[PDB]
Design an enzyme around this catalytic site. Structure first.
Site, PDB file in Angstrom:
ATOM      1  N   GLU B 232       1.090  -0.813  -0.077  1.00  0.00           N
ATOM      2  CA  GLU B 232      -0.145  -0.325  -0.037  1.00  0.00           C
ATOM      3  C   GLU B 232       0.920   1.400   0.150  1.00  0.00           C
ATOM      4  OE1 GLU B 232      -3.575   2.185   2.385  1.00  0.00           O
ATOM      5  OE2 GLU B 232      -3.665  -0.106   2.683  1.00  0.00           O
ATOM      6  N   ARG B 310      -8.281   4.101  13.775  1.00  0.00           N
ATOM      7  CA  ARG B 310      -9.013   2.269  13.391  1.00  0.00           C
ATOM      8  C   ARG B 310      -8.911   1.517  14.700  1.00  0.00           C
ATOM      9  NH1 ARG B 310     -11.692  -0.639   9.796  1.00  0.00           N
ATOM     10  NH2 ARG B 310     -11.342   1.319   7.767  1.00  0.00           N
ATOM     11  N   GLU B 691     -10.587  -8.547   4.493  1.00  0.00           N
ATOM     12  CA  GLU B 691     -10.718  -7.808   6.229  1.00  0.00           C
ATOM     13  C   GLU B 691     -11.055  -8.145   7.892  1.00  0.00           C
ATOM     14  OE1 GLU B 691      -9.821  -3.908   5.723  1.00  0.00           O
ATOM     15  OE2 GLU B 691      -7.623  -3.746   6.783  1.00  0.00           O
TER      16      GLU B 691
HETATM   17  N1  LIG Z   1      -5.178 -13.325  -2.056  1.00  0.00           N
HETATM   18  C1  LIG Z   1      -5.173 -11.911  -1.422  1.00  0.00           C
HETATM   19  N2  LIG Z   1      -6.925 -11.519  -0.656  1.00  0.00           N
HETATM   20  C2  LIG Z   1      -6.611 -10.702   0.294  1.00  0.00           C
HETATM   21  C3  LIG Z   1      -4.768  -9.710   0.199  1.00  0.00           C
HETATM   22  C4  LIG Z   1      -3.656  -9.889  -0.493  1.00  0.00           C
HETATM   23  O1  LIG Z   1      -3.270  -9.607  -0.719  1.00  0.00           O
HETATM   24  N3  LIG Z   1      -3.911 -11.268  -1.135  1.00  0.00           N
HETATM   25  N4  LIG Z   1      -5.115  -8.720   1.229  1.00  0.00           N
HETATM   26  C5  LIG Z   1      -6.526  -8.670   1.837  1.00  0.00           C
HETATM   27  C6  LIG Z   1      -6.227  -6.749   2.321  1.00  0.00           C
HETATM   28  S1  LIG Z   1      -5.104  -6.422   3.369  1.00  0.00           S
HETATM   29  C7  LIG Z   1      -7.537  -5.915   2.099  1.00  0.00           C
HETATM   30  S2  LIG Z   1      -6.877  -4.845   2.444  1.00  0.00           S
HETATM   31  C8  LIG Z   1      -8.720  -6.633   0.440  1.00  0.00           C
HETATM   32  C9  LIG Z   1      -8.344  -5.566  -0.031  1.00  0.00           C
HETATM   33  O2  LIG Z   1      -9.174  -6.545  -1.691  1.00  0.00           O
HETATM   34  P1  LIG Z   1     -10.816  -5.499  -1.541  1.00  0.00           P
HETATM   35  O3  LIG Z   1     -10.756  -4.530  -1.500  1.00  0.00           O
HETATM   36  O4  LIG Z   1     -11.248  -5.655  -3.004  1.00  0.00           O
HETATM   37  O5  LIG Z   1     -11.559  -6.652  -0.299  1.00  0.00           O
HETATM   38  O6  LIG Z   1      -7.954  -7.824   0.586  1.00  0.00           O
HETATM   39  C10 LIG Z   1      -7.098  -8.881   1.263  1.00  0.00           C
HETATM   40  N5  LIG Z   1      -7.695 -10.141   1.106  1.00  0.00           N
HETATM   41  O1  HPA Z   2      -9.280   2.905   6.944  1.00  0.00           O
HETATM   42  C1  HPA Z   2      -7.594   3.013   6.417  1.00  0.00           C
HETATM   43  N1  HPA Z   2      -7.342   4.317   6.168  1.00  0.00           N
HETATM   44  C2  HPA Z   2      -6.658   4.119   5.112  1.00  0.00           C
HETATM   45  N2  HPA Z   2      -5.914   3.136   4.573  1.00  0.00           N
HETATM   46  C3  HPA Z   2      -6.719   1.979   4.963  1.00  0.00           C
HETATM   47  N3  HPA Z   2      -5.965   1.179   4.414  1.00  0.00           N
HETATM   48  C4  HPA Z   2      -6.983   0.097   5.453  1.00  0.00           C
HETATM   49  N4  HPA Z   2      -7.743   0.680   6.528  1.00  0.00           N
HETATM   50  C5  HPA Z   2      -7.418   2.172   5.684  1.00  0.00           C
HETATM   51  O1  MOS Z   3      -6.279  -2.116   3.998  1.00  0.00           O
HETATM   52 MO1  MOS Z   3      -5.210  -3.865   3.323  1.00  0.00          MO
HETATM   53  O2  MOS Z   3      -4.298  -3.069   2.226  1.00  0.00           O
HETATM   54  S1  MOS Z   3      -3.867  -3.596   5.062  1.00  0.00           S
END
Ligand SMILES: Nc1nc2c(c(=O)[nH]1)N[C@H]1C(S)=C(S)[C@@H](COP(=O)(O)O)O[C@H]1N2
Ligand code: HPA
Ligand code: MOS
Ligand SMILES: Cc1cc2nc3c(=O)[nH]c(=O)nc-3n(C[C@H](O)[C@H](O)[C@H](O)COP(=O)(O)OP(=O)(O)OC[C@H]3O[C@@H](n4cnc5c(N)ncnc54)[C@H](O)[C@@H]3O)c2cc1C
Ligand code: MOS
Ligand code: FES
Ligand code: FES
Ligand code: FES
Ligand code: FES
Lengths: 305, 756, 164, 151, 51, 164
Positions: B232, B310, B691
């Protein structure tokens, strides 16, 4: 099958076809590095940034790959993959009476949650031994069982039981610079002889502070009186060690509560770690050395009764 | 219409065949070079010299890059408090000082190893305790307060206070950070192929370092082999370096990190220390809570503030607490900067909550489920931050999980096991969770899409979201297909790129399906509006017929779509405004067996019930639940990062850092999605799933803590209401040490000791 | 004055006239042969992302033998007269997938997909040694493979269909 | 979000200076310097179903498309301009971004009233006509067939 | 506002310095191959064979 | 025992150990050295898109001589101890443009730009021999350079500024 030579930008590799070629090469270049599975040497070169300008690979040599069934035990060439060892031992255990397979069963316990099939198909028996990691799961078993090592060079050939003296210092073995480990004989268990092996289910440092043990007791014929006792531990020092002071005191003593107390008192003392000992987990490791012996103590009682 | 159908991830077949391309699988240009970072080996020190003499003797060495080589700016990071390359001082052990460029990755590796750095050490701060003692914090205290704490504590029958620590976590995405940068040689233009969740910031940060407008920089993301939050922001550490090398040499350049570099340099989940005090009635009803949270943020701000925000939003978990005060501080330390990790502060705050809740039940001598149930919010209650819980489904999940897991029957069996076993014990626990859905930063809750319909009727969709394995592209295709009323076989998504959808928020916060789904939907509505006259003229025509008619009538077959989440904006100064769009809920029950002599344990059975609204794709959603839960299992029970006293990470690979393995998962592992619970607030009644389930992995931790309690009743004292501290993760060391007996005390040796 | 190194990759002969002892099989596959299905996940034997099948005619046992190995640790200089099979050796979406590839994809055992080639090769190797394994042998086949996405359940459920 | 602008249109550059003209158009329409605007390439994933770059009309038609897209951008920025009247382009763009206003748009133009029929000889064939006159003088060599273009 | 002004072609300087990239100026991939068309030498004919 | 070919390109030493007699300078510059400013427009000497400047020490008239040549027809094997200058050797937008480059650009002498490097090299070569040429000498320098876009007028007009 002939000797092959590969030349790199930094490294020369010789693929040895016979034992005679290997011993000649080793005598010509004592500092030449042996490689079988490369599961240790690869890490050393990549991560520990060691360089070995001369490498010999003995994997093609018969002997070194031979599995031999003898009167005293099963002999494995030093280049035998751990998977082949596991297969051979699993067959021996399925075929032979329980009382002859105590040491084999201990080896197999240490191989259970050890790496993956990928690693076990290429990692050699001899490589694990000679790597001599403080946290080797096999060396404590071989030490506690008095497994025999056949060691050879141009001219010389000797067989030694593995014991405390074989590991003098960190990552060092009692081999000459021109010597190679040829074969390893894992003993059959005798009557009134019992064996256990245990290991810590966590690892937090690259090669220290993971408790692993081989434990053996031999009784006087048909009794619970100790004739021999061996407790060997990895992950309690810079090398595989034996609790010799403690076990020596138990000879001709009986397998009961008093022995359990004395051994525990002995182990707490002999294996004591300083607050600053490398790897930490000081309380945990001490507790394991004792809890493992306790498990052994109760297992031996079930096997006696 | 495939919405609600378990369609396999669109790329699954290609991934199984090794045909799916990840960043480093992209073919190399004939002139392509390779970069290897040179990194600090000290926690805090002045750089006295950098010697490249021996590196220059490595065959294929091209150059060493340092801060002096940067044409634009050496100031970077989310809050501009980082360097691209360290100049005078290093502030953690993997602090990037420079990079070597060479003709092969082997040569780069060799040369980087032979670069000598000379240092002069400075006083370092490594632990949260160190930072507290030194007043070493980023910014001031964050706080949420409701009710009157004095008064709540006056009215309480019992008070329990304590301290708790939760260790961090390494992302361990199977694909490490990777960038290829291609300089065009015209006008500062560069094209970058990047394993990132944040193409926008990648683009911005590269442009800033080079001192060129953002419009010169194109960032493209086909897919990631995992992100989990670790890509990220921290992906820019590699991206910016590779871009500089491309700039300086004029050749394409790439870098993919080795596992040991990645673990050292890129940061992880924030460790948290909490000090807490809870006041409660003999009934178990909570009357007052005070929690001070401290996170180990490392050597820059990055996302640490939002993570703590958060955390404060989730300190209630599912429980109504009328008098509450939570605070948070960010510890400034000489460790790699910590970052986003799936859950983003939520799991830490929820863990702290469940810990004190477990202590309430023990102190009251009441069954844990009863105490949890009694304290649970009701439909339409306000949280501690004054948001109304509309559609609070925890009660339904709870009752379904209790029934389907056969909790009460199995609870009797665990007790029977503990009666009959001396050196092994079982434990069983049921835990709820709620997770707020939305970025905590209101402006990030926006999404764009761009849809083209080609004259054969085939449709190309682009949106701001990136694919990291979560099945986002699959879901967007399902949505587009339903919206347009055409088969999925007509729709394709190729990649994410900054020249198709600009200014995209990071693919994060579990909301991508929601917000990109809405953006795609809106673009689809526009296309449908434009084709309507043609459909009317030719109602028995095909899609292809209508599309060709529109083209020949000079109607545009391309449109943007945009979505902005409505009614968002919480104020820490009024304690009002919606922080989240809605909440995802779930419950998990887990059973474990511990070996009291070794500290090893077995996960016997886990049952999970999750409220995911009306799932767009039950297969993808169940896969997300299972994956998140296992990562949580790792966080609370297996994964442990260990540092030397000098602040150097010891655990830098799979040999020393243990993520869940095939053999780690519960023997019986059951997941159910709650039925008949449509969400009015998101696309096709669905809810975010990425998450929210991770914290349910804590059911294993609290089952272990139950088993330990039984062990302590066996061999330590007779005090049933004894509270003992168990920090996370519950590794074999912690479990074993907690099982106080004749071995831990040395009573077995004849010494006197603190056991029974 | 070096010998030629001769090995096979997916049935095709490779003649390497200037083998460097330092070169790993993974490096050779990815950067010399351009076969990028086999992945780097750790470089230290722990993750199995780089898993391939090796086959040779074993002169001690006579037998042709087949076994899995980590390409990240295997020097190419150990591979003279050895056959390597990678994920692209067993099937593809452009010809036909192997049942192992089909099953893992359809059982939702691939999310990000980065570990999938390695897991496919571990399962393939097992089946080449034991055409009808037990459920027990199947789970034990993967101690050397890590997956961060799936929580493993779907991979095992998919492959359980090969058992009994 | 730095205020730099990337323009894509269906037309291709072949030396005729179409991208230059489009930048001049965009700069005029947006009321920002040409240094803030860039055109990188023509691509089928940015603008689909493009007519060939031909018939001499690219400036007319893509100019109109670019103009319309610029007008959309200006309308969206207008509220932020009014909030910060002594601010800069860059301030207004960042304010719009932070208020979750989209900074991306399409533009489209369709030439009106075209449709000649060969079966009726009616309806406009062309939008308008371009006109010119040229006067040239030559000298020929009657013995070789060579000539010189004089003026 | 430059409309109506004789602004030089934006790429002219890069074209004079040989920095402007045309199709064949794009760097080749390591594995890039090259094609050459095989073309009829006859105005109108049946193709009997290709060797 | 084939000899080394040694020449210079933009001041930089090129040692070709394995020179093929069939290789043109244009192929070498573009496809070995990666200097793509010099263009292929015909491969038969008629268009001048591939124009470079060559310099050598002339054993007869003593001096260093400078002349223009078509890289598409120059065998690299003729170039032992010759210095090559291309468009990238005289100036760039990243550092500073040469007056010749600046003038053709600002004078509207470049439309598609494909012939521009060759014309630049023709004008540059003329100035390296005669820093103050006549109008007549200027047009003559371009007999071997074709342009399809500009109608030539703006190029001549921009370069006339160098005359007198
Ligand atoms: N296979 C897989 N699943 C995953 C992830 C990933 O890197 N790989 N990241 C997780 C995280 S940190 C988040 S925030 C969400 C983001 O995807 P979405 O917003 O499309 O659910 O996927 C989750 N599931
Ligand atoms: O709540 C959020 N704010 C910013 N970045 C993020 N990534 C996951 N959750 C958040
Ligand atoms: O908000 Mo998932 O990229 S920690
Ligand atoms: C992922 C993984 C997990 C592992 N897990 C464990 C574990 O849980 N427990 C454990 O105990 N070990 C473990 N190991 C270590 C493993 O058992 C050893 O690395 C392996 O047995 C070394 O054998 P090799 O053939 O690969 O040795 P090589 O790397 O080829 O050589 C090892 C050393 O032995 C020397 N040598 C080899 N053969 C001879 C010979 N016959 N005579 C004299 N010297 C010789 C070499 O010169 C070198 O110094 C693990 C390894 C990996 C990669
Ligand atoms: O209309 Mo111009 O492309 S002939
Ligand atoms: S890359 Fe992880 S085991 Fe080889
Ligand atoms: S599917 Fe992502 S690591 Fe296994
Ligand atoms: S390419 Fe036309 S003269 Fe050389
Ligand atoms: S500018 Fe196009 S050929 Fe001269």
């Amino acid at each position: 099958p002939k000797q092959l030579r590969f030349e790199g930008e930094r490294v020369t590799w010789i693929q040895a076809s016979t034992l005679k070629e290997l011993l000649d090469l080793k005598a010509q270049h004592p500092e030449a590095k042996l490689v079988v599975g490369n599961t240790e040497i690869g890490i050393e070169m990549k991560f520990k940034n060691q360089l070995f300008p001369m490498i010999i690979c003995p994997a093609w040599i018969p002997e070194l790959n031979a599995v031999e069934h003898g009167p005293e035990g099963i002999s494995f060439g030093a280049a035998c993959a751990l998977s082949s060892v596991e297969k051979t031992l699993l067959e021996a255990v399925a075929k032979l009476p329980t009382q002859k397979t105590e040491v084999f069963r201990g080896v197999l316990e240490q191989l259970r949650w050890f790496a993956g099939k990928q690693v076990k198909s290429v990692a050699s028996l001899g490589g694990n031994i000679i790597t001599a990691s403080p946290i080797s799961d096999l060396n404590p078993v071989f030490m506690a069982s008095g497994t025999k090592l056949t060691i050879v060079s141009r001219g010389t050939r000797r067989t030694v039981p593995m014991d405390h003296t074989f590991f003098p210092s960190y990552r060092k073995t009692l081999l000459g610079p021109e010597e190679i480990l040829l074969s390893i004989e894992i003993p059959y268990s005798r009557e009134d002889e019992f064996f256990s092996a245990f290991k810590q289910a966590s690892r937090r440092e690259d090669d220290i502070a993971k408790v692993t043990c081989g434990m053996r007791v031999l009784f006087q014929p048909g009794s619970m009186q100790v004739k021999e006792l061996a407790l060997c531990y990895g992950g309690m020092a810079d090398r595989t060690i034996s609790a010799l002071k403690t076990t020596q005191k138990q000879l001709s003593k009986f397998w009961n509560e008093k022995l359990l107390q004395d051994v525990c008192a002995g182990l707490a003392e002999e294996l004591s770690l300083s607050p600053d000992a490398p790897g930490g987990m000081i309380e945990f490791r001490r507790t394991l050395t004792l809890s493992f012996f306790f498990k052994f103590y109760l297992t031996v009682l079930k096997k006696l009764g | 219409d495939t919405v609600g159908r378990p369609l396999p991830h669109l790329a699954a077949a290609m991934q199984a065949s090794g045909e799916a391309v990840y960043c480093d699988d992209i073919p190399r240009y004939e002139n392509e070079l390779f970069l290897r970072l040179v990194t600090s080996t000290r926690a805090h020190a002045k750089i006295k010299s950098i010697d490249v003499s021996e590196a220059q003797k490595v065959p294929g060495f091209v150059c060493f890059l340092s801060a002096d080589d940067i044409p634009g700016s050496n100031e970077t990071g989310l809050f501009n408090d980082e360097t691209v390359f360290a100049k005078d001082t290093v502030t953690c052990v993997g602090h990037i000082i420079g990079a070597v460029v060479a003709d092969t990755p082997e040569h780069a590796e060799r040369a980087a190893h032979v670069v000598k750095v000379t240092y002069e050490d400075l006083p370092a701060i490594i632990t949260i305790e160190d930072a507290i003692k030194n007043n070493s914090f980023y910014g001031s205290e964050l706080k949420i307060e409701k009710g009157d704490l004095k008064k709540g504590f006056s009215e309480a029958d019992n008070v329990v206070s304590g301290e708790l620590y939760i260790g961090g976590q390494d992302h361990f995405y199977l694909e490490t950070h990777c960038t290829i940068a291609i300089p065009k040689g015209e006008e500062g233009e560069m094209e970058l192929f990047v394993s990132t969740q944040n193409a926008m910031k990648t683009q911005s940060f590269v442009a800033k370092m080079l001192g060129v407008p953002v419009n010169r920089i194109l960032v493209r993301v086909k897919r990631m082999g995992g992100g989990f939050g670790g890509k990220e922001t921290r992906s820019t550490l590699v991206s910016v370096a590779v871009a500089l090398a491309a700039y300086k040499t004029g050749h394409p350049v790439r870098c993919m990190l080795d596992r040991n570099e990645d673990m050292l340099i890129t940061g992880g989940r924030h460790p948290f220390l909490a000090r807490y005090k809870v006041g409660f009635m003999k009934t178990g009803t909570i009357v007052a809570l005070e929690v001070d949270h401290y996170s180990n943020a490392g050597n820059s701000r990055d996302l640490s503030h939002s993570i703590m925000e958060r955390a404060l939003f989730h300190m209630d978990n599912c429980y109504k607490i009328p008098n509450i005060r939570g605070t948070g501080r960010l510890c400034k330390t000489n460790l790699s900067s910590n970052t986003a990790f799936r859950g983003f502060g939520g799991p830490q705050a929820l863990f702290i909550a469940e810990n004190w809740m477990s202590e309430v039940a023990v102190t009251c001598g009441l069954p844990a489920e009863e105490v949890r149930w009694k304290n649970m919010y009701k439909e339409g209650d306000l949280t501690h931050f004054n948001q109304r819980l509309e559609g609070f489904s925890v009660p339904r999940c709870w009752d379904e999980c209790l029934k389907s897991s056969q909790y009460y029957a199995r609870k009797s069996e665990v007790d029977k096991f503990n009666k009959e076993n001396c050196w092994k014990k079982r434990g069983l626990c049921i835990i709820p969770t709620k997770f707020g859905i939305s970025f905590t930063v209101p402006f990030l809750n926006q999404a764009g899409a761009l849809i083209h319909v080609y004259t054969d009727g085939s449709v190309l969709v682009s949106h701001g979201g990136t694919e990291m394995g979560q099945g986002l592209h699959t879901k967007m295709v399902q949505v587009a297909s339903k919206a347009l009323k055409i088969p999925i076989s007509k729709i394709y998504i190729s990649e994410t790129s900054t020249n198709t959808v600009p200014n995209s928020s990071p693919t994060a916060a579990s909301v991508s399906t929601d917000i990109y789904g809405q953006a795609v939907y809106e673009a689809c509505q526009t296309i449908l509006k434009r084709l309507e006259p043609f459909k009317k003229k030719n109602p028995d025509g095909s899609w292809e017929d209508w599309v060709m008619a529109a083209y020949q009538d000079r109607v545009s077959l391309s449109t943007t779509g945009f979505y902005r989440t409505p009614n968002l904006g919480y104020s820490f100064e009024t304690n009002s405004g919606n922080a989240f769009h809605y909440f995802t809920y779930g419950v998990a029950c887990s059973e474990v067996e511990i070996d009291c002599l070794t500290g090893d344990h077995k996960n016997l059975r886990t049952d999970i019930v999750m409220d995911v609204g009306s799932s767009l794709n039950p297969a993808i959603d169940i896969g997300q639940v299972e994956g998140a839960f296992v990562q949580g299992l790792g966080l609370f029970t297996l994964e442990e990062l260990h540092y030397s006293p000098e602040g150097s990470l010891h655990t830098r690979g799979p040999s020393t850092y243990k993520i869940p393995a095939f053999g780690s998962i519960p023997t019986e592992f059951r997941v159910s999605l709650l039925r008949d619970c449509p969400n009015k607030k998101a696309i096709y009644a669905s809810k975010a799933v990425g998450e929210p389930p991770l914290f349910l992995g804590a059911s294993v931790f609290f089952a272990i803590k139950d088993a330990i309690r039984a062990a302590r009743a066996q061999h330590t004292n007779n005090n049933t209401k004894e509270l003992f501290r168990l920090d996370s993760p519950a590794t074999p060391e912690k479990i074993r040490n907690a099982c106080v007996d004749k071995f831990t005390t040395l009573c077995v040796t004849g010494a006197p000791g603190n056991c029974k | 004055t070096a010998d030629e190194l001769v090995f096979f990759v997916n049935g095709k002969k490779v003649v390497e006239k200037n083998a460097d002892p330092e070169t790993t099989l993974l490096a050779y596959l990815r950067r010399k042969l351009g076969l990028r299905g086999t992945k780097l996940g750790c470089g230290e034997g722990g993750c199995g992302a780089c898993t391939v099948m090796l086959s040779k005619y074993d002169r001690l046992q006579d037998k042709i033998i087949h076994f899995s190995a980590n390409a990240c640790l295997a020097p190419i200089c150990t591979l003279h007269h050895v056959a390597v099979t990678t994920v692209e050796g067993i099937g593809s979406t452009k010809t036909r997938l192997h049942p192992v590839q089909e099953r893992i994809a359809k059982s939702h055992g691939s999310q990000c997909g980065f570990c999938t080639p390695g897991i496919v090769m571990s399962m393939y190797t097992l089946l080449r040694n034991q055409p009808e394994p037990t459920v027990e042998e199947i789970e034990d086949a993967f101690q050397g493979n890590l997956c961060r996405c799936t929580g493993y359940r779907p991979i095992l459920q998919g492959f359980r269909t090969f058992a009994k």
